[PDB]
Each structure stands twice: as structure tokens, then as C-alpha cells.
Design an enzyme around this catalytic site. Structure first.
Site, PDB file in Angstrom:
ATOM      1  N   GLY A   9       0.612  -1.414  -0.150  1.00 54.78           N
ATOM      2  CA  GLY A   9       0.407  -0.152   0.387  1.00 54.78           C
ATOM      3  C   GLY A   9       0.549   1.454  -0.021  1.00 54.78           C
ATOM      4  O   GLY A   9       0.231   2.611   0.685  1.00 54.78           O
ATOM      5  N   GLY A  46      37.676   7.631  15.220  1.00 57.62           N
ATOM      6  CA  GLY A  46      37.418   7.633  16.238  1.00 57.62           C
ATOM      7  C   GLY A  46      35.727   7.888  16.136  1.00 57.62           C
ATOM      8  O   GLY A  46      35.182   8.077  17.252  1.00 57.62           O
ATOM      9  N   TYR A  84      26.192   3.266   3.028  1.00 63.00           N
ATOM     10  CA  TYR A  84      26.063   1.898   2.474  1.00 63.00           C
ATOM     11  C   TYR A  84      25.381   0.434   2.945  1.00 63.00           C
ATOM     12  O   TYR A  84      25.731   0.916   4.280  1.00 63.00           O
ATOM     13  CB  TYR A  84      27.498   1.842   1.718  1.00 63.00           C
ATOM     14  N   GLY A  98      30.301  -4.999  -1.696  1.00 61.93           N
ATOM     15  CA  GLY A  98      28.830  -5.057  -2.201  1.00 61.93           C
ATOM     16  C   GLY A  98      28.603  -3.967  -3.342  1.00 61.93           C
ATOM     17  O   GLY A  98      27.889  -3.344  -4.173  1.00 61.93           O
ATOM     18  N   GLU A 121      20.720   5.345  -2.195  1.00 63.61           N
ATOM     19  CA  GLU A 121      21.229   5.843  -3.253  1.00 63.61           C
ATOM     20  C   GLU A 121      19.943   6.666  -3.180  1.00 63.61           C
ATOM     21  O   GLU A 121      20.816   8.436  -3.625  1.00 63.61           O
ATOM     22  CB  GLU A 121      21.277   5.960  -4.551  1.00 63.61           C
ATOM     23  N   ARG A 152      21.485   8.947  -0.241  1.00 60.60           N
ATOM     24  CA  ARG A 152      22.567  10.358  -0.786  1.00 60.60           C
ATOM     25  C   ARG A 152      21.630  11.797  -1.737  1.00 60.60           C
ATOM     26  O   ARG A 152      22.309  12.338  -1.506  1.00 60.60           O
ATOM     27  CB  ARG A 152      23.093   9.742  -1.452  1.00 60.60           C
ATOM     28  N   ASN A 176       3.219   4.287 -10.433  1.00 61.50           N
ATOM     29  CA  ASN A 176       2.969   2.588  -9.744  1.00 61.50           C
ATOM     30  C   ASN A 176       3.883   1.676 -10.790  1.00 61.50           C
ATOM     31  O   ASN A 176       3.221   1.154 -11.449  1.00 61.50           O
ATOM     32  CB  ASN A 176       1.829   2.060  -9.654  1.00 61.50           C
TER      33      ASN A 176
END
Ligand code: CL
Ligand code: CL
Lengths: 125, 256
Positions: B11, B46, B76, B117, B173, B176, B191
Site C-alpha cells: 500500500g 574515532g 551504504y 558490495g 542512493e 544520498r 506505480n
């Protein structure tokens, strides 16, 4: 996809040397050689990178590590899938690698930003 | 535990998706340390492990749940969780390897893949490039199922790789780039499902480099321009940050 560096050798201190790297492989073939960024390294240190440009002003743009700026230069011939590293005022002994990738080129000064690596070539001042 | 953000493909609307991405972004970066109007992700250096990751729980209409782990330093995906199983990409270095050990201790079975990846590797396994892999609510619903049934051997590795590419793009992405968020919104509104065009793909390739140029730029002006592609594949360059404000949403931390 596959890179072979040459031009490595023994130089006298304060001399000059030009390294060469030629790229070949499936996918060049979008993903043409021109769409890949290249970078020279030598632990492993960033030496300088190169990106290709079809804009009006330059056929490519380069990026040099500070320590190297006033000595080394980078160029390339896109049609021959080749990139060069011109080293003047040698001092610097190490193994020089060439890397390439979609995420490589100018502004990519980290080893993890390149997906493909060459065997390397030895340079001894 | 790390922060969890929820989303469902059941939905789904342009607004539910937008709420989801905004929420993700909110958890990825303090919001402090902004540069040229663009928020910069926390420095990997750190950085306390209890702040290193966030979690993204996805569900679809088939009533199935999967949880993705994101690294807040680059937004990522580093691995995921499906029921009693948790899987991880191959870490670039030992520190990252050491870092991901803190994830999903909640489970018995912890696997680390031989592959990383990066899009290049996943596309090889998928047997398809990003340009040929459809995105949208439809693909995401099917991606979630696949990730979920991977412990049974029922979903093949290519299908898994294709699913990783879909999730990464629609989540990492999108977070980003407002541009890419808007690209999913358009798909969701009408859709439709469709592969990303050259403008999406080149932004993905260049995110690291764009981040670098902006933060090192002389008051906005790049030292040297960066080349991107339009929807029609034609190329063009950008010379300063101003043109990127409505496009990039997060940047990877750099010096200074
Ligand atoms: Cl692990
Ligand atoms: Cl500073």
C-alpha cells in the site's frame, strides 16, 4: 578490467622516467574506457589520478598529490586505452600501480575507490 | 541496539516512501557539520561503534520481514538479517571487518560473503547491469522476498545480487541524492517499474568524487569540473556546488 603497467626501471637521482599503463577487457565494451577513471599509486600511497573530458576546454583533467605536484605529470591517449605518469626530479623508489574504476578519476585518492588493479612496475632511483 | 527505521511496500505511496527516506537521513547524520548547505556524514575516524550503524527493516505484502544494516559514514549497505540468519559483504579492511562484528549479535548464524558490495561485482553475479534492472515498489517487494528466502537455497545468487542492487539504489542512493529519491517517488506515484537512466547511474558512480570536490572546493568552485550524463546519455560537466544543491543530500566526510 585488466591493466598492465610498464616503463619501470632504474634511474639516476634527479633524473626523469615515464610509466605507462594500457587497459583492456570486456565492458570497454556506458562503460567505455572513457567512462572509467584512472589512478596511480605506489603501504600504498596515492600518486595522482585522471578523468576524461569531452567538454570544450580539455580532453582530460588530472589530480596530483601535493608532494608530487611540481614534479610528476599525468596524461593519456583515450583512443589507445593508455595513461601515462611522467616523473621528473626523481629521488621515490617503490612499486607503482595503476588502478581504474567507475568511481575512480580526479577526487578519488583512495585505494578503495578503484575496482581494478595492475600488477605494478618497479622504479628505483 | 542500533536505530531501526521501518518501511513496507504494501500500500506504499509517494508520501510513505518520502517519510521513510527523510527518517533514514535524519538518523544517518547529526545534521551538524554542514558544508555549502549540504550535510556531511560522520567521520569514520574515532567514531564510537555504538554509533557506526543504523538498521532498515523492510516488509512487503507477502508479510515478510528483512533488516538491512547501513554504515552511517557512507550510507551504504553492509549486510542484512532475515529471520535466524544474517549475512555480510566482504569488508574492505580489518577495521571494517572488526566493526561489523557488532552487528546482529542477536543471531546464531553469521555469514560473510567472499564478495564485496560494489556494483561491479553484484552486476556480474546478477548477470545484469544497473541499467537493465528495474526499480520501483514492485521490484522492491520482490527483492524483499528473495533476501528472505535465501537461507533455504530457494533463491539463487544472481537473484540475490539483483535484489542487493535494487535495495541499495532505492535506499542508500535515495538517501544520498534528492534526485534519486524523486526518481523512486515518480515510479511509486504512477506505480511503474523501470531501470535507472544514465543520469542516475553516473551520480551513483560519482558520489564519492562529488563529495570530495565540494568540501575541498575554493568557496564552491571545483578545482576541476566533474563530468556527468543526462537522461539521454549525453555528457555535461559541473563546475561548482551551486548546481548540486537540489540534487545531493549527503556527502561522505573528508578533510578539512
Ligand atoms: Cl562477521
Ligand atoms: Cl579546517
Amino acid at each position: 578490467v585488466q591493466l598492465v603497467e610498464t616503463g619501470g626501471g632504474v634511474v639516476q637521482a634527479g633524473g626523469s622516467l615515464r610509466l605507462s599503463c594500457v587497459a583492456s577487457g570486456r565492458t570497454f565494451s556506458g562503460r567505455t574506457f572513457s567512462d572509467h577513471g584512472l589512478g596511480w599509486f605506489r603501504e600504498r600511497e596515492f600518486v595522482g589520478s585522471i578523468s576524461w573530458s569531452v567538454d570544450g576546454d580539455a580532453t582530460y583533467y588530472t589530480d596530483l598529490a601535493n608532494s608530487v605536484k611540481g614534479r610528476f605529470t599525468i596524461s593519456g591517449v583515450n583512443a589507445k586505452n593508455t595513461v601515462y605518469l611522467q616523473m621528473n626530479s626523481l629521488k621515490d623508489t617503490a612499486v607503482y600501480y595503476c588502478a581504474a574504476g567507475l568511481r575512480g578519476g580526479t577526487y578519488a585518492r583512495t585505494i578503495y575507490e578503484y575496482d581494478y588493479w595492475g600488477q605494478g612496475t618497479q622504479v628505483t632511483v | 541496539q542500533y536505530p531501526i527505521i521501518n518501511f513496507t511496500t504494501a500500500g506504499a505511496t509517494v508520501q510513505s516512501y518520502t517519510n521513510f527516506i527523510r527518517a533514514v537521513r535524519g538518523r544517518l547524520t547529526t545534521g551538524a557539520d554542514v558544508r555549502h548547505e549540504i550535510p556531511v556524514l560522520p567521520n569514520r575516524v574515532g567514531l564510537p561503534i555504538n554509533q557506526r550503524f543504523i538498521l532498515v527493516e523492510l516488509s512487503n505484502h507477502a508479510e515478510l520481514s528483512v533488516t538491512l544494516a547501513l554504515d552511517v559514514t557512507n550510507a551504504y549497505v553492509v549486510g542484512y538479517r532475515a529471520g535466524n540468519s544474517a549475512y555480510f559483504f566482504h569488508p574492505d579492511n580489518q577495521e571494517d571487518a572488526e566493526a561489523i562484528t557488532h552487528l546482529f549479535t542477536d543471531v546464531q548464524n553469521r555469514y560473510t560473503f567472499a564478495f564485496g558490495g560494489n556494483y561491479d561485482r553484484l552486476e556480474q553475479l546478477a548477470g545484469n547491469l544497473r541499467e537493465n534492472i528495474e526499480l520501483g515498489n514492485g521490484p522492491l517487494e520482490e527483492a524483499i522476498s528473495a533476501l528472505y528466502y535465501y537461507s533455504t537455497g530457494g533463491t539463487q545468487l544472481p537473484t540475490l545480487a539483483r535484489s542487493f542492487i535494487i535495495c541499495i539504489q532505492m535506499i542508500s542512493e535515495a538517501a544520498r541524492f534528492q534526485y534519486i529519491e524523486g526518481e523512486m517517488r515518480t515510479r511509486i506515484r504512477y506505480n511503474r517499474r523501470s531501470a535507472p537512466d544514465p543520469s542516475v547511474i553516473t551520480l551513483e558512480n560519482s558520489w564519492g568524487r562529488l563529495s570530495t570536490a565540494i568540501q575541498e572546493s575554493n568557496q564552491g568552485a571545483f578545482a576541476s569540473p566533474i563530468q556527468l550524463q543526462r537522461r539521454n546519455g549525453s555528457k555535461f560537466s559541473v563546475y561548482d556546488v551551486s548546481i548540486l544543491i537540489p540534487i545531493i543530500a549527503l556527502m561522505v566526510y573528508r578533510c578539512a
